[PDB]
Amino acid sequence: STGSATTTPIDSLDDAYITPVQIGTPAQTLNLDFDTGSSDLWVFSSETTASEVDGQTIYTPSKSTTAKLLSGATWSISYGDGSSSSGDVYTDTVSVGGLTVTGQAVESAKKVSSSFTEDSTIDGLLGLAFSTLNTVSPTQQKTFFDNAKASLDSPVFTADLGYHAPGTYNFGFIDTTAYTGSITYTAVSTKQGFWEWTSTGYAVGSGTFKSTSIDGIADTGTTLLYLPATVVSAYWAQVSGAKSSSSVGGYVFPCSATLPSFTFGVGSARIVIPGDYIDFGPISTGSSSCFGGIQSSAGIGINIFGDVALKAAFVVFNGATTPTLGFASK
Numbered sequence: 649s650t651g652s653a654t655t656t657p658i659d660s661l662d663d664a665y666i667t668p669v670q671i672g673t674p675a676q677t678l679n680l681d682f683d684t685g686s687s688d689l690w691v692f693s694s695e696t697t698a699s700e701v702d703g704q705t706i707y708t709p710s711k712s713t714t715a716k717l718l719s720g721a722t723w724s725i726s727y728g729d730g731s732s733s734s735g736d737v738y739t740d741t742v743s744v745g746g747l748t749v750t751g752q753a754v755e756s757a758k759k760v761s762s763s764f765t766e767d768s769t770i771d772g773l774l775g776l777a778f779s780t781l782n783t784v785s786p787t788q789q790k791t792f793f794d795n796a797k798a799s800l801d802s803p804v805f806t807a808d809l810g811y812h813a814p815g816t817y818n819f820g821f822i823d824t825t826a827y828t829g830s831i832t833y834t835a836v837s838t839k840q841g842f843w844e845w846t847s848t849g850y851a852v853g854s855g856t857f858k859s860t861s862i863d864g865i866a867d868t869g870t871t872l873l874y875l876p877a878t879v880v881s882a883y884w885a886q887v888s889g890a891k892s893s894s895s896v897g898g899y900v901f902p903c904s905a906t907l908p909s910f911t912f913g914v915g916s917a918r919i920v921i922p923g924d925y926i927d928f929g930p931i932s933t934g935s936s937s938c939f940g941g942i943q944s945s946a947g948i949g950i951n952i953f954g955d956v957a958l959k960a961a962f963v964v965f966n967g968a969t970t971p972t973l974g975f976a977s978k
């Protein structure tokens with residue numbers, strides 16, 4: 649089998665991407681944040697604290713003839729931005745772009761933190777990291793991809809995120825029309841539960857390439873590109889007026905600036921992030937100070953190849969016995 653779904657930025661800044669997901673019988677379609685940085689499928693639901701729902705579409709298990717309460721199971725998760733959610737668990741039929749999994753763990757939110765409440769466009773998350781990170785207790789549950797894998801034509805999924813435009817998530821095949829040149833594959837460590845790999849270096853604008861190993865994770869659920877402070881300092885030093893701001897929380901730059909591109913290495917191959925991808929707009933409405941899309945990972949404890957980097961590429965999440973990651977230009 650295969651599936652193919654369109655993913656859409658939630659706002660004009662590409663702050664995140666939502667993909668329609670069908671849950672239950674009859675289908676309830678919710679717009680979920682496909683997150684290769686986490687491993688829980690959780691949704692706003694009829695069980696969510698009334699006051700914490702503000703425009704989201706909810707999953708109502710009582711309306712689904714195929715939903716079953718997973719007895720005694722609970723979940724609780726905290727993400728890297730300090731956000732969190734928790735609740736109970738159902739199993740139900742879940743379909744993504746024509747690909748169907750029966751008996752998928754659908755984690756129903758009883759509580760969500762304010763950032764979720766405040767974002768009416770995201771109805772929940774669909775995790776695509778390794779199931780070893782899944783938070784369900786006392787019986788850990790598998791991800792949609794893990795459950796579908798044996799059924800797929802090939803045990804892969806691909807992420808093709810757009811810059812201020814829709815993109816695609818494919819399951820089970822590689823669309824050879826969706827990228828240019830060849831796909832370069834690179835080793836993955838699953839030891840922390842992530843799609844963790846090692847970039848071979850970087851360049852700033854028309855700068856010479858710096859060969860240096862940068863370990864980090866391919867994370868579609870993170871908006872920005874988080875890299876070592878040395879790398880980030882080298883980038884922003886090429887932008888007149890750019891500065892690290894403690895008050896704002898990162899590098900800012902004049903909104904009048906033209907940003908240089910940023911290149912990262914995949915083996916001997918190179919992926920170029922155009923400068924405009926690194927502009928995340930005024931720090932506050934009306935400000936002429938803009939927030940940077942490349943930020944230091946110092947204090948995060950891990951480098952993150954978030955959407956700013958991934959949207960520059962066609963990315964293969966290869967779920968074979970020994971997983972690997974592939975990158976192509978597009």
Ligand SMILES: NC1=NCc2ccccc21
Nearest residue numbers: 683685727728729869870
């Ligand atoms: N993977 C993720 N990075 C940041 C974040 C916030 C909320 C949910 C998922 C993520």
